[PDB]
């Protein structure tokens, strides 16, 4: 088709596949999108995309990535990546800030962070 003579009518006319071939030719003319963050080339993505590979390729039963004993054909909706096992969201804020620079050292930062988290 390239040698002759924009990619459908002329191709179908010359060849006649035929019309199907012309239509296919006209249509014709890491993949995870998570570059290694340890490497220099590393963009910024949300945690659901920066950890999707770890979540999908881990077996909680045998503690091995892509285990041989348990196989999942990705039939479920991403196998509930990490599900919601981080249920223990309870935490305690302590005094004695990090040092010369800290959110606790700056006045009002703690309340602002609490308000932002309290969007609900």
């Amino acid at each position: 088709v390239n040698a002759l003579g924009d990619k459908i009518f002329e191709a179908i006319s010359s060849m006649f596949e035929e019309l199907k071939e012309k239509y296919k030719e006209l249509t014709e003319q890491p993949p995870e999108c998570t570059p290694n963050i340890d490497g220099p080339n590393a963009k910024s993505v949300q945690r659901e995309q920066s950890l999707h590979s770890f979540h999908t390729l881990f077996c909680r039963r045998c503690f091995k990535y892509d285990c041989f004993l348990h196989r999942k054909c990705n039939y479920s909706f991403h196998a509930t990546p990490n599900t919601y096992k981080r249920k223990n969201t309870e935490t305690a804020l302590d005094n004695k800030p990090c040092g010369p620079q800290c959110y606790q050292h700056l006045e009002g930062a703690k309340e602002f962070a609490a308000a932002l988290t309290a969007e609900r």
Binding site: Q101, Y103, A109
Partner: peptide, 20 residues
């Protein structure tokens, strides 16, 4: 790495809003 705690708080504030 690096990313001082005050810088971390500023980053958190900046990330707020915007978006048989």
């Amino acid at each position: 790495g690096t990313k001082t705690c005050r810088q971390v708080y500023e980053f958190r504030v900046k990330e707020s809003s915007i978006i048989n």
